[PDB]
Amino acid sequence: AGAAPAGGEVRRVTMYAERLAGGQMGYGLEKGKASIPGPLIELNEGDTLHVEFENTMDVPVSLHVHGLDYEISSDGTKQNKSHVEPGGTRTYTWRTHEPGRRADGTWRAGSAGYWHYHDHVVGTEHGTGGIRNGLYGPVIVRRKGDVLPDATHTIVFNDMTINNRPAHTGPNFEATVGDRVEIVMITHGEYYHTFHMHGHAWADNRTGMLTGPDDPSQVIDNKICGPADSFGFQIIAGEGVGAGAWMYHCHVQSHSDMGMVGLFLVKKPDGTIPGYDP
Amino acid sequence: GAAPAGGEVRRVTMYAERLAGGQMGYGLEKGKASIPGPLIELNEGDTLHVEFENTMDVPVSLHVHGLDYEISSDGTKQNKSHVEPGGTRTYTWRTHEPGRRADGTWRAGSAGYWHYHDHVVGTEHGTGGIRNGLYGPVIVRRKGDVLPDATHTIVFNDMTINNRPAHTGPNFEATVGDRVEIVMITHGEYYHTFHMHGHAWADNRTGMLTGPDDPSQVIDNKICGPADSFGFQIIAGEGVGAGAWMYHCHVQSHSDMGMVGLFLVKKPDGTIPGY
Amino acid sequence: AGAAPAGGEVRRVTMYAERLAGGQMGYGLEKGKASIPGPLIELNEGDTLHVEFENTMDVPVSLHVHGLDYEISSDGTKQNKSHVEPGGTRTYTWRTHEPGRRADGTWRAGSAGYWHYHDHVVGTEHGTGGIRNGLYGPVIVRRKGDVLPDATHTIVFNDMTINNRPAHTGPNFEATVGDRVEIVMITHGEYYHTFHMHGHAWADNRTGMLTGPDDPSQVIDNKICGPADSFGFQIIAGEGVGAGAWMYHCHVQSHSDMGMVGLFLVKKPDGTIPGYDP
Ligand SMILES: [Cu+2]
Ligand SMILES: [Cu+2]
Ligand SMILES: [Cu+2]
Ligand SMILES: [Cu+2]
Ligand SMILES: [Cu+2]
Ligand SMILES: [Cu+2]
Ligand SMILES: [Cu+2]
Ligand SMILES: [Cu+2]
Ligand SMILES: [Cu+2]
Ligand SMILES: [Cu+2]
Ligand SMILES: [Cu+2]
Ligand SMILES: [Cu+2]
């Protein structure tokens, strides 16, 4: 349960770019604890986040965010001289805003949504190598009153992997029937995909939930998405369908056949998953 | 008219058969398998028990998008709810209306344009069965939804429409004024862009704006990928009159290679001008 | 903020198809002034446009429009024998309508939206050769009260080009901070793309702007699109982010690396751009 508070706090966080095993690179909030996808960044509309960023690698890296407000000096592009030299540090500043009525009378949308950050300088001047190595992460910006979940899982379709994992190796995620589960879904690389969840549908809008009986957003369980698209939704685990090993996968047929599959294990209260047998 | 509130327990029997030259299909009676398979329509609240029978020499399953089912009705080998050659099984699909949850949020109803397909032929994601023609449309209506005079199903399965040979349509006929409903499904390996000459729709659940407050983009072109489903209703010839109105994938090599047909909109006397 | 009036005017223009340098083809409103993309046609909901069209080329060409009302006589296809022979002429007629309640109580959508026109006859019966050559252009149909921009810019992703240009030639677009800028984005050809704008987001709906605090459309800065997709939006240039050279690009990694990139040059009031090299 819960709802998002009105935002406006100034926050600081340490971020590191680190080599990981397998030629992979990752972001982390703590030295030695980088992860792919990188750490989830949660902000409420109006918050400011000062990211004290350190590049612990032997090659330049950058941090570039979708959707938030930044001045060009926190762009994370080499083109604007906001990348980070090997061993260097720099403070990237992100700002967010509430919606509101402009003086001209139009409506200014807020920053709330499902967003992401990624490298922009490794391999190419668009971060093609660093994205491919794992330098991407989720950003959620909440509007005041937004329903909060019991858990949030990030699913990144990165070329032909999920979260840079080997073919047919999840990730799986667990919930109990009735848990309010939040999915952040991000795509990267060269390929278009279609993201599909067995047993669970969501609304194709900002929060993934219909606002009420007046909301005309299509209700879907299958969504085409391409490089750098990002969306999210919230579902009630097992709602209307019960416990089980509920597949999610890319529905591009060869993509699922070659490994782009994982499991949303929905448990009964006693912890069991009927008919689940790997 | 419009659609009623649902809550009926419906039954249907569905067969999977082989068809000419390696294709495979679903049907309501044997020897009558079609590609795409039979349209299933429900009202939110309805339950459907599909008495399924596999008539083929290989396993098959029935898996549906969007509807409520238990893990036992998955239609996946993974959960052992596939059907062995010659075997039978009853799949149960449920639907629900929208309403406020216990937690105060709004729960979406089942209404939408959906589809069902095989999941075990060729691969454990049904790649061979989908290619062969094992897919069909499902419509679930909300109470009050306007009913059409006709419903046509267009599936973009890899480089074909409805598994037909290149440059063979299908065409669909209507008369000016008809309320024409289109179920559009995509399957296989390619993205596509579905496009209709002369008619636009709203990019929302019904394909029609709710009213003057519906901000949905109005479009005549929509990108879709494998297992995307959507639908819409148009008044044929509205504002444009009768004639042979093209629809096609708008990916240029795709239309060029034959993903194209004609929506033949007839004058009340039955003649299509310029055709 | 100035607004679109109600429509209902009958407008007339002349349009020519002409060969252009580099084995190209384009539309223009005056002989010898064709461009790629073709001239922007703007209509108010309910206006009619009669296009006095001439084919100055040695192959059949045509004019086909998305989104607008036309009879098969102006369909623009060899199917409905509405193409234009070499040297020939023809008058194409487009109509638009306002929205309203039908007899049966259902709501008829207006013509308002971001649309486009292209050839349908060169190369094949689907205009593949014409579209590749540059026979395409934008159409904006405005609804009464729609907010009017200070400038409109058309970005067409045509196969692996922007506006048929060579790789890494932009185009760039200039604005001043505070300007209300309108983007028209059209895709053509064989491939999918994902349009991305640095520092500026918009609403995934008809206008690119949220109606108010009840509009649930997702706010995005990244959007997958395929051949003959069209959408548009207005942004306040630099809002929340400030002046600077703001990148836009296809976010498919190999597409950006290979030059599907341009610049949204947002200038301070004095015309300078921080950190940019003119
Ligand atoms: Cu970028
Ligand atoms: Cu995929
Ligand atoms: Cu499914
Ligand atoms: Cu990006
Ligand atoms: Cu599946
Ligand atoms: Cu296609
Ligand atoms: Cu068209
Ligand atoms: Cu499926
Ligand atoms: Cu066409
Ligand atoms: Cu591209
Ligand atoms: Cu960006
Ligand atoms: Cu077209």
Report the Cα–Cα distance between both ends of chain A, in Å, rounded. Answer: 33
Inter-CA distances, C95 with A188, B239, C17, C54, Å:
41, 8, 21, 20
Q: How many whole angstroms from its chain centre is CA B219?
A: 19
Q: How many CA atoms lie within 13 A of A53 on its CB side?
A: 27
Chain length of chain A: 278
Contact at CB, A229 and C247, closer than 8 angstroms: no
Tell me phi and psi for residue B71, to 5 degrees: -55, -35
Q: Which two tokens stand for residue A81?
A: 């001289």
3-state secondary structure of A130: helix
Strand partners, B98: none
| H/E element, B254 | helix B252-257
Among A188, A224, A187, A186, which residue's Cα sits nearest to residue A204? A224
Residue in B191, B217, B243 nearest the CB of C80: B243
Residue of C nearest to B220 (CA): C67
Single-letter residue type at C72: I
Experimental technique used to determine this entry = X-ray
Q: How many whole angstroms from its chain centre is CA C43?
A: 13
Distance between CA atoms of residues C252 and C246, nearest Å: 18
- SS3 readout for B106-121: EECCCCEEEEEECCCC
Domain parsing of chain A, residue ranges: 1-146, 147-278
Residue of A nearest to C246 (CA): A72
Tell me phi and psi for residue A23, to 5 degrees: 70, 10
Sign (positive or negative) of CA dihedral B81, B85, B89, B93:
positive
3-state secondary structure of A141: strand
Contact indicator for C137, C38 with CB cutoff of 8 Å: yes
Instruction: Name the one residue in this structure whose structure tokens are 């209507």.
Output: B174
Single-letter residue type at B63: H
Among C8, C3, C95, C113, which residue's Cα sits nearest to residue C51? C95
- Those residues whose C-beta lies under 8 Å from the C-beta of residue A258, and which sit 6 or more positions away, are A160, A167
Q: What angle do CA B20, B21, B27 make, to 5 degrees?
A: 35
In what side-by-side order are the strands of the sheet with A48-55?
A: A25-28, A10-19, A48-55, A89-95
Q: How many whole angstroms from its chain centre is CA C42?
A: 10
List chains adjacent to chain B, taking adjacency as at least 3 C-beta pairs closer than 8 Å.
A, C
Distance between CA atoms of residues C136 and B124, nearest Å: 44
Distance between CA atoms of residues C93 and C229, nearest Å: 22
Contact at CB, B193 and C228, closer than 8 angstroms: yes
Integer-rounded Cα Rg, in Å, for chain A is 19
Among C159, C155, C177, C160, which residue's Cα sits nearest to residue C233? C155
Q: Which two tokens stand for residue A31?
A: 């030295």
Burial grade of B124 (CB within 10 A; 0-12, 13-18, 19 or more): middle
**C253 contacts in A (CB within 8 Å)?**
124, 126-128, 131-132, 188-190, 227
Distance between CA atoms of residues A234 and A256, nearest Å: 23
- Those residues whose C-beta lies under 8 Å from the C-beta of residue C270, and which sit 6 or more positions away, are none
**B145 contacts in C (CB within 8 Å)?**
none
Strand partners, C14: C52
- Those residues whose C-beta lies under 8 Å from the C-beta of residue B51, and which sit 6 or more positions away, are B11, B12, B13, B14, B88, B90
Contact indicator for A112, A45 with CB cutoff of 8 Å: yes
**C203 contacts in B (CB within 8 Å)?**
215
Distance between CA atoms of residues C97 and C92, nearest Å: 17
Contact indicator for C27, C35 with CB cutoff of 8 Å: yes
Ligand nearest to the CA of A126: 1
